[model samples]
Every structure is written in structure tokens, then in C-alpha cells.
Target: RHSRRAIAAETVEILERGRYTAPSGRVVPIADHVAQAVRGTRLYRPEKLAVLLEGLGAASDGAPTRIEVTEETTLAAARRLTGAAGDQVACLNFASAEHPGGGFLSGAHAQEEGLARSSGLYASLRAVPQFYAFHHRQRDPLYSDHLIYSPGVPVFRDDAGRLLEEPYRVAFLTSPAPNRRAIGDLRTVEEIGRVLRGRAAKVLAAARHHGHRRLVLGAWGCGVFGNDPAQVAETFAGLLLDGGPFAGRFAHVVFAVWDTAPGAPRHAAFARRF
Candidate 1:
């Protein structure tokens, strides 16, 4: 059984397990609670000390004997130390081994701001493109038909930092993996098609909410399907043009090929007016 301190350890193992990448195996360092245990180590070094002092605006006023672990407590300290009423603190550094003793400072004098983009289907999809990309590409047979979506998928996010609702917002897939062999174990177009079908409802709903009438779907490589690629595109287009579940909502579809070494032929075969 892990003790409270051990269970609450902010070390790489725990952090990595919860990281976005959840990368196969990568270590990440974290300083969950800084205490007296690190009294004389690099934790108390000059560079680190200077950053803390600077954050507190303590050059002329003086130094801090101890820092309150919470942001509210730190803000109060900043007001007292800097003689500024609207004092604030922010931690902006990426926690990594490459930069050991590091952190961030933000408030009245230092704060990074960003603009807010209108919420729409496409924007929502853009927010989580990689997630979808990783999915359809997971198993390949059924051709996975990734060419149907491209420029990757878009994940939508609100200004406040919350990811928007389901059906996702907006998304586009333009090409299959450049390396066709990467997903060799994936066979059977029907099985792959079923996998993607599960995500289409939400993905399409997102596109409709974003003001797009249609989604672009196309291919990007040469396969046994042969020379006249447009013929194949027509068949795919016909399926949706027939006015079934995928008929009206999809507005952007692209097609291309990497059959040539020096150059390639890529084009947009589908688009619909808003």
C-alpha cells in the first residue's frame, strides 16, 4: 500500500499516466509540494531564487521567508511585497527535466493573453484532430479511407478552455497515411468502415454546427484500384449524393495521390455552399 505522500507523489510516473500524449513511455518530473526536504540542494540555488524573488518583485522591498503554496496566498504576498494592489502570480513553464529549477510568474505586470475565435463546428474539430487521426489510422484494411478527411481533424474549444459538445464541431481528412504499410494488420474494408461509422454521427453533428454544408473526403495514394482515380472518387461521391445519412451535411472532400516520386496530383473533388 502506498502512503499518503507516496500516493500523492508528483513524480513522472504519476504525471505521465495522466498526460495527454500518454506516450508509450516517457518520464515527466513534477514538484507537487516543495518543502524543507530540499533545503540545501539545487532547489535553493541562485538562479531559482532569483526567479522567485523577481516573481514577487522583491528586489528593493526584501525577500520572502516562505511562500504560501496556494495562488491566493501568493497574491496576498505579492501585494504586500510589491506595494501593488492588483498583484497576481502565474506558473507558465513546461515541467520537464531539460529545465530543472523552473516555474512562471504572472499578474499585473506579466500575463500572456490570447484572442477568442468564434465557436463553430470546424473550430471544435480542430481542437482534437490528432485524436481522430490516431483512431481511423489505428486499423487499416477496409482501406480505412482516410483520404476522405484531411488537413487533419479540428477540435473546438471555448474561450474559457472547455472543449465544446459532441458530434464534434468540424473535421476534415484529406489523405491516407503516407506509409501504406504502417497499418498492414488492418484488413477487411467492412470492419474498418464499421469502426469509422461509430464516430461519424458526432463528427458530422459538429460539422453542421460549424456552418459547413459538407465534409471533404478523398484519397491520397495509388493502390490496386488502378489508373483512373476519378472513377473511384465518383463512386464515393455517388454514395453520399444519393441522399442517405451522409447526404446533405458533408461539404468539403479532397483527393490526392503520392503515386509519383518527385511530385503528386492532389485536388478537391467535393465542396458545398454554406
Candidate 2:
């Protein structure tokens, strides 16, 4: 029997080779728990943690950590993890030219509104016409990944309806699909992996450049765009592993999932798989 540490070592080797075959010639599918363990090292969701605690028959002491993972904004979540000051910058996901509203109707709209109302990101993005020039460009197959960045904007907090100083916002684009119609057609796992890897690299570079060592991320196309959650989880877990492109690039990274009332079932599925 393999010890936990032994399994983790093998998992790292498997990910680095970008293959599922173990040294003993055993085939390991991405859905297997060992591959899924990669996610435990980087990505986290509160609901999932609760399940873990419940399964272990463990309970937090009365002085439980007060992390309300469900209703908080990405920046808010990042702040709690890093204890970053009001001037520190944080990253949030935005769509490419394909998602005209940057996924507003798909729950990412809330992310847009938070940055726009609190950080002026929406206004800044609206000022750039070139940003929307690449819609449907991915269909040609020659199009490389495209990413855009906005200068840091002041973030604010609403305390009893009064706005207070909060951390700054730095928005980055993670547009893997050309349009809503293109999402379902994106059936290839390798294709999705390639896009995610590129986007992850770009986001990490941008975050590092701005002196931000912390970031907040979410389900990119897994929402209304309709990508497979399990695949997304596997892709992210592999790429965000210790030797992956995003490894050691940041001090803290938080993946916020909508695992609450509105879309509980979908979120639960993702939580379980991840």
C-alpha cells in the first residue's frame, strides 16, 4: 500500500509528464481521487471543507473561523486569505470579446459589478475598442490566447451602507470561448487544457508584475458557458500544482465557487469532483 506521501510524489510526477500512467504501468484517469488530490493543494471551497470535516467526525472549536465563502466578492475573499491592505491589488476573472457583458448574466456579472462599482474596472474596459475586436476569432484555429489587463483601481467596502476603503482591483481576461455557441462545441479536453494553461500563465504574470502575490479565481467557462466542471477541475489542479506554471507565483490563491442556494446542485457537483 502506498503511503499518502508516496501517492503525492507519484501524483506530482504524473502531472509533470502530463500523463496518467504510473511508473508501474497503471493507467490513472483524471477522475481518479489521486489526480483530484492535486486540487487539494491549491483550490479550496468552504462547502467542500465542511464535508471533509463532517466525514472525519471532526468539528471546529467554538471559535470557528468566520469565513462566509458563499456571498463574498472575489476581492473580499482574497483579502481574508492574504490579510492584504487597502492598497494591495487582486485579480478577478473577466470574459473575452465573446462575453460582451463579461459573463454578467452567468454570475460572473456580479464580479463585473463589484469591480465596476467599487473599482472602475468596467468603465476602463469600456474605453478600449480593441478589447472587443477578437470576437469569434478563435474559430479560425490560428488565434492564440488573448489577455487584457486594467491598471489597478481603488476598491471599496460597504459598511452599513457606507463605502469604506478596501483593497484595489486588477482585472484579467480568461476568454476560452469565442461565443456562447462555441462553448458546447469545445468538446476536446486537450483543447480546453491548452487554453486554461495559457490563461493561467498570463494571469500569474500580470499578478506578479503588479506586486500582488495573492489572487482570487473562479469557474471560468463552467458557469453559463457550460464547460464540464470535472474537466475544468482536473485541468486547473494539474496546472496549478507545485511545479506547474502558476506554482509559487503567488503567496495565496483562492478559488471561489457558488456553492450556495441559487445553483447548489451544479456547485455541489463541482465541489465533489474538485
Candidate 3:
């Protein structure tokens, strides 16, 4: 929370100004990403998920998705993958369907907040106002399968700071995992389990629809949302591995489970599974 809160606020201002100034006052323009995000932003309704999925048959062609469980922030894994991949790179955002950047401007700490602060994602997120409005009114723990796609969003900083040599573009798939923990009493255990498994597939569908192969995904709802790390890992395994519908479809998939300490529960969960 220390520097992150400050950085989050700074990021919003940078989004507003369309540039970043280094400590030495070196100016870098990020207007392109913001503009691209504004135009590329799209809202995919629940029924439309089928179109995204129907567009793909069994993607058994290329090499199976090489699953890597890493102790790194989402932005770090995205940067590394983009260096090698150069294209088709995307990252999943554990989003707040109700809030544009999920308190990112206020410096609230969480996965979504981290993504919004470090990238040009918030611009696109804010572009689709209905995406937030609908989810907020529904009041469902599973939320809707409504997804927000933000492509070519510039990632200007790592989770640490605004000091990358150059900003890179990575598409973002924004969806909320069933709010089992915080939305506790509102959801039954069985309902939460069912929704999570189904929604995990939705994340993949949205990514593939937008033509992304190298993906960064992780302990989706394992934080304050109160999903068990092991459960989330196994759910993904059943879908992404074991000849699942999306198997052999991608080059690489990294589970960027950020952890302050090595071997932390969330980080280790996927490592053991994949």
C-alpha cells in the first residue's frame, strides 16, 4: 500500500495529461494508447459470449498452451511475454464490474486497482459506461458474463514504478470472478463454485475473440473476494489443461500470481496444479 497508493493517484493524473514525466523531467507521450483504448473499447454481452466461442472450433492446432506459474506481478509477466511474443499478448483483469477502475483513483489496493494504475486500461474501462451501470444494478454475486475488452492498452509502468524503458501494449480482458467472499451471504457455496467455473471460460473466450494467444492469468478471486487459491487453480487447470476446450490453442500462458513473499499460498497454488 505504501508507494502503490501514491502511484495509483499519479497514474490517474497521467491518464488525464496523456504523458508521464520522469524524476529528471524526461517527458514521454502516452496519448496514442489512450486514444486507441477509447476507440477499441467494446462491451460483450452475455449472449454474445457464444459468438466469441462459436468463432473458434476446438483450437487443437498450435502447440498446447505452456502454463507457467510465476511469482510476478501481472504487469511484469505481461512485459516479459510481450518481449518474446511481440504480439497477441493479453492479460486478465480481476475487475470490479460496478466501478470503472474499482477505486483505482482513490488508491484502493487490489488486482484490478494495480492493473488500472499501471496501464492505459482505465481509459477504455471508462469508455463503456453501461458495463459498470448494468453490473451494479443486477446485484448478483456471479455477476453477468458481460465482459469489457480493451485492446492495445499501453502498460506504462510495472507494479513498482513509472520507470520502464518503454511502454508496451497488451490487451486486457476485464471480468469479475464471482464475489464469493465479500458477497458472502448473497451467494451459496454451490452457486459460487458453478459461476466461477463458467466465468473462467468466459475470460478465455473474450481473450481469444480479440485475437490474443500469449495470456497472463492468475489467482483470480483469491484475494479479498475469498476464493480458495487451490480451487481457482484447479478450475483453470480443468479448462486450460487436460485437453480442455482451449488446450493447444496458445503459445504461452503465465499465471502471474503476485505475492509479497515467495511461496505464498496464492502463488504456490497454481504452481502445484500446473
Candidate 4:
């Protein structure tokens, strides 16, 4: 650490002395200027400032930047997380290998059901005759819990009565079993963290392959599945911010926790933790 600091100091001195010159014959005091400007910013904590510096450096270098974690309480449409820009992937939690069913599309399956109903995701799949012909091929029989990816699904039909030009890409992953299992049977918080991190790798990898630079996700397993919101929030925050595999695969990570009504416990829990 001491040697690193010494070298950093020497580099700063060299830059400030105008030893570095640009193609335009400009005397570049890059290191000194960056230090002065960054140090004067309002943030004083090392952790908070580190994120700012990293973002700035990554942007300048044109790197595949890390995700900037954020929590939103507003019940904004998932697609809006990308500012209607249509460049990011949306991740929704899946209850199990089975498709959507049961109560008014609410509870643990609310997000998935809502997307399926509104986007015509299920109907679209069913409309394709090959869907049934290849149904058996899609089933992951051996897996009781894990993540799965589905290609972009048309969210709505357009004025010409055709599916919209830009479809929303969705990633589905199981949130520890919804009901049917004792609360005690649920995986430990650490285990849940492992599953999430592992799944995140696959999801982000596919997103990257498809040219997505941001991702919108929900509070997995924290709804009817009976997982603790605080724990779920901690796990996600750590992976997105603590240098996990997803560190530089995405430019931003949005956690959209729905607050359907005032004083919603789930929303409040995540809000506080974040």
C-alpha cells in the first residue's frame, strides 16, 4: 500500500510538472487537475467517492462499466427504468419452472404475471404452433431452483395491430419456492446471495451478448416467497456494488420494488435497506 501511494504521488508530480504533452501541444496536468476537482466535491466518505471516481474513469476509458445500484419505490413501468430508451433488459422473478397461474396475477408472481398479461407474452408463445411442438424441449426438469432466460417478448400491439417494433427482453429466475415450503425450509440468506450472484452472471452475460448495457431487476424472493427484504436488498446491493462478477457488465442496475399501496411493508423494507 505504501509503495502504491509513493508511485501515485510521483505520477501526480510528473503530470503537474507538464511532463505529459498532448497531440495538440497542450501541457497536460491531468493527474493534478483530476485530484483537485474530485477532492473538492461534496462527498467526503471514501466509499461514496470511490464510486464517483470509478464512473468517471470508466466513462473516459470507454470500458464496459459497472452497474450503479439504485432503489426506486415508485410503481413505474419496468420499461421506464431505461428512460423509454429501449436499450436495457428487464429481469422478472419466476416462482418455479412452471408458467404463470393462480390468483389475480398478484403476490410472489405479480411481476411476471403482470408482464405476461400486459405484454401478451404467454399468448405470443402459444400463438406459435411450434411452441407446443417444442414444449418438452423447454422444460428444465432436473432443476428445482435457478435462473432462466427468455428472448425479447413484444410488450404490446401497435396502431397497425402488429406487435411493437421494440420488444422487451426478459430474464426469468426462480425466487426460493413461493409457498408449499416451510419458512424454515427457505434457503439461508447467504445461500440466496449465492444463487442470485450466480444467476446474475448468466443474465448479464446474455444481456451483454444482446447489446444491453443496463438491467432492471426486482426484489427476488421477497414477496410471497417469504424471504426477508432486508436480506434480499443486502445481497443485491453487495453484488452490484461490491465488485462481484456483474461489476463491469452493466452501466446501471435498477431495483424496481412495487409499492401498490401506501404503507406497503415490502416497499418500506427495501427503501430502508437501500
Task: In angstroms, give how far residue 138 of model 2 lies from its true place.
Answer: 6.3
Error of 2 at 126 (Å): 1.2
Q: How do the candidates rank by TM-score, highest first?
A: 3, 2, 4, 1
How many backbone clashes are present in model 2?
1
lDDT of each: 0.26, 0.45, 0.82, 0.43
Candidate 3: count of backbone clashes, pairs at least 3 residues apart or interchain: 1
TM-score of 4: 0.53
The clash tally of candidate 1 reads: 36
Candidate 4: how large is its RMSD?
Answer: 21.3
TM-score of each: 0.27, 0.57, 0.92, 0.53
Top lDDT: which candidate number?
3
Candidate 1 versus the native: TM-score? 0.27
* Candidate 2 lDDT trough over 10 residues, lowest sum: 37-46
lDDT of 4 by residue, 1-274 (tens): 3433343333334433524443455543334333332232121122332333344313222565533334442123345654456564555444333443212233322554444433434432223333223323644322232333344442332222233334343433222233322335445656655655544444444445445665666566555555666666666666555565456556656667764556666666666755
| C-alpha lDDT (0 to 100) for residue 161 of candidate 3 | 71
The C-alpha stretches of model 4 lying farther than 4 A from their native spots are: 1-75, 81-83, 86-88, 101-109, 124-146, 157-187
Candidate 3 stretches greater than 4 Å from native: 1-3, 23-25, 183-188, 261-263
